[PDB]
Nucleic acid binder design. Sequence first.
DNA 1: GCAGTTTTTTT
DNA 2: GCAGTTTTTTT
Lengths: 240, 240
Amino acid sequence: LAPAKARMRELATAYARRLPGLDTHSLMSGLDATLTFMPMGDRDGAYDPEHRVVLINSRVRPERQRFTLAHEISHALLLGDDDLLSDLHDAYEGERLEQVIETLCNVGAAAILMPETLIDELLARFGPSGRALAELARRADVSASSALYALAERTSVPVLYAVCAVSALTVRASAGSPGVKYSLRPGTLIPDDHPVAVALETRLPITQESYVPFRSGRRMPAYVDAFPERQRVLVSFALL
Amino acid sequence: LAPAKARMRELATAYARRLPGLDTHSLMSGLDATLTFMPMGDRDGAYDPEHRVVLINSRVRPERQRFTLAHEISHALLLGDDDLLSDLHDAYEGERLEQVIETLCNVGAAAILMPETLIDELLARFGPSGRALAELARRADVSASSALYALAERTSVPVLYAVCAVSALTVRASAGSPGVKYSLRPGTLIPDDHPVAVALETRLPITQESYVPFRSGRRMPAYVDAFPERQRVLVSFALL
DNA sequence: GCAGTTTTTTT
DNA sequence: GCAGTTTTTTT
Ligand SMILES: [Mn+2]
Ligand SMILES: [Mn+2]
């Protein structure tokens, strides 16, 4: 499956090199298809390969629209590589094949929206930090969640990235870089004396040694980098 | 191409036999896909085979919605027969392949909506007539135009079917049965003394010997069967 | 894994 | 042919 994921990243990056820019309107430049924003209710997107139409839901937030669009573009890239398609047919089936294809298109979509070049630029400017996470979401015009998964994958040291927001600050989303085994489950509570909540209240960014507030009550030592945004904090728990 | 058209009729009829009925909501019963009616602006329909979604425009008239739906269903039937698909790949290309596929799906769609059984039932009850045309559109829940093309194809004698409506009664749509070479171009004018206009004005159906009012001014003898509806007349010009 | 959205894990 | 929608043909 990782082979397929690699090949999907290849196609998507080749696609995104050919694009003039990553603005929402330049993304469809390398595809013989038309794009229509309209109200789609619950559905976020659709790609009709036979009539060459991409439909994106106009009622959802821009960052979602952008990820759905790159998802749908990756659907096209996949239908165009009969080799990758052939391998998947010889390796999966039925419902399993469906999930594999959907995951690959999510992979390809992040590969279009967030080039390794941008992630490494921020990594060198800001380190594997809450600040880098915040900057990635803004500079790539993606949601904090998509940026977190992308930033974490490219982080070569032990770090547990998280997105927190009142819901009562709680972990809304989180991922660890390749080596990490620990998991900060969504809804894990943020103590009010913890720098992440201090960041949100003070509205200032905080770098300092603190702890991961796992639900088990284990306070695992970590160095926290928290960047406060509007009712949300993007944080990096660096582990030793 | 006719081979492909035949094979498309095979799949569609096999599909429609399995259906409980031809009501708009039973048509999607034999397909692992979901159907969503929503406002689609200019577009009439879309089929996403990867997410298994059929989208039909809610703003267009029911008869159109019904034809678009059977069109989209025929798209699915085609993606499922790799043999028919293979032949088309070995026979057409690029834009030509696109039109071929679209025509076949229109073929399959009429085959779903209008079974030979229904057409022959009306042919035996009403003859190759304007009345048969009218009854076909109502009993199949299709537009007069789609019924005309279907009825004409199954008419074994020389007849030029037409749909006329004020636009000034003019030929809005027309087709001739297999043998006919003449063409009653859309916009051909209906003289006000001609029984078709008499039918519309009297609101009574007329069977009588008359003539085809070709634009060339040639009044070719024909036996007319005209059934008056709401601001429209479905007529059969039987030729010798 | 896969999430794509505001020694510290835990079917 | 392909339209799928209210001797009489005519790039
Ligand atoms: Mn998808
Ligand atoms: Mn089509």
